[PDB]
Scaffold this active site. Structure first.
Site, PDB file in Angstrom:
ATOM      1  CG  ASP A 240     -13.265   3.853  -2.477  1.00  0.00           C
ATOM      2  OD1 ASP A 240     -12.174   4.457  -2.373  1.00  0.00           O
ATOM      3  OD2 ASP A 240     -13.386   2.632  -2.231  1.00  0.00           O
TER       4      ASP A 240
ATOM      5  CB  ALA B 145     -20.259  -6.559  -9.758  1.00  0.00           C
ATOM      6  N   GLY B 146     -17.643  -5.336  -7.522  1.00  0.00           N
ATOM      7  CA  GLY B 146     -17.219  -5.282  -6.124  1.00  0.00           C
ATOM      8  C   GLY B 146     -17.507  -3.930  -5.499  1.00  0.00           C
TER       9      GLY B 146
ATOM     10  CB  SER C 272      -0.927   0.012   1.218  1.00  0.00           C
ATOM     11  OG  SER C 272      -1.647   1.229   1.311  1.00  0.00           O
TER      12      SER C 272
ATOM     13  CE  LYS D 241     -13.896  -1.395  -1.797  1.00  0.00           C
ATOM     14  NZ  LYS D 241     -12.886  -2.432  -2.156  1.00  0.00           N
TER      15      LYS D 241
END
Length: 253
Positions: free
Chosen positions: A94, A116-117, A13, A63
């Site tokens: 987001d 589609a997440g 990250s 998430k």
């Protein structure tokens, strides 16, 4: 205060270095870490996170998962994804990142959204907030397609090439491209798009191809990252505009 990013994977990250540099430059005592938690260990390990950190970010594949453990905002509920937590409350920044990344830009329709997440659902929410009507989701898994409640059309990945040909904007919201993978879409289908948008922070084959073909707007995930980070810091009550622009502005060049 203590913050981190949780996910799987998350060890690479870019967030810890940026938030920590930001805190130091602002003269703040806050810290930002990382917790790479496998899905099988989440239910046990999230309880530790909730006790040890004032707030945190969540990325894939957590998430949606983290929602059960916090009190989500109305928009986070609609999106079925939380990427920013602060003291028991869940938020989605987001979609804010997406809206702000597209400032000054007309999003032409139809719009294809790949995936589609939680990332996709944030993008769809953002598009709907921007008055976009014709949204076509192209995804891989049956489960994620069934989690979609938005007013969209849904197609399988084998249909991507055909559907993009009939569209004007394309959003990749998947991890396809992170390791140099290509999406099943032709030059012919891509060439006449007005927007190619990739949530992935760095150059992907999709972005590189779009540049070769002269697509008007080609936007990588760096602007989305910049603006979601801004919103995170506002939620956490630790936003310094000048220091933010100085430190986080580095992702934009």
């Amino acid at each position: 205060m203590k913050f981190c990013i949780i996910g799987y994977p998350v060890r690479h990250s870019i967030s810890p270095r940026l938030y920590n540099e930001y805190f130091k430059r602002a003269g703040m005592n806050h810290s930002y870490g990382m917790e790479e938690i496998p899905p099988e260990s989440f239910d046990t390990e999230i309880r530790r996170i909730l006790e040890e950190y004032d707030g945190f970010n969540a990325t894939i594949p957590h998430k949606e998962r983290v929602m059960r453990y916090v009190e989500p905002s109305e928009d986070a509920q609609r999106i079925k994804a939380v990427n920013c937590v602060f003291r028991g409350k869940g938020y989605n920044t987001d979609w804010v990142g997406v809206v702000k990344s597209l400032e000054g830009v007309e999003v032409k329709e139809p719009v294809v959204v790949v995936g589609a997440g939680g990332a996709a659902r944030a993008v769809i929410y953002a598009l709907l907030q921007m008055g976009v009507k014709d949204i076509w989701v192209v995804n891989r898994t049956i489960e994620r397609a069934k989690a979609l409640d938005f007013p969209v059309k849904i197609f399988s990945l084998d249909q991507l090439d055909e559907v993009v040909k009939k569209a004007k904007s394309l959003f990749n919201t998947t991890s396809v491209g992170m390791k140099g993978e290509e999406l099943p879409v032709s030059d012919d289908s891509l060439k006449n798009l007005s927007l190619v948008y990739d949530v992935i922070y760095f150059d992907t084959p999709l972005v590189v191809k779009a540049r070769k073909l002269g697509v008007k707007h080609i936007i990588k995930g760096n602007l989305m990252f910049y603006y979601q980070a801004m919103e995170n810091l506002k939620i956490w009550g630790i936003y310094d505009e000048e220091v933010f622009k100085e430190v986080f502005g580095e992702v934009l060049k």
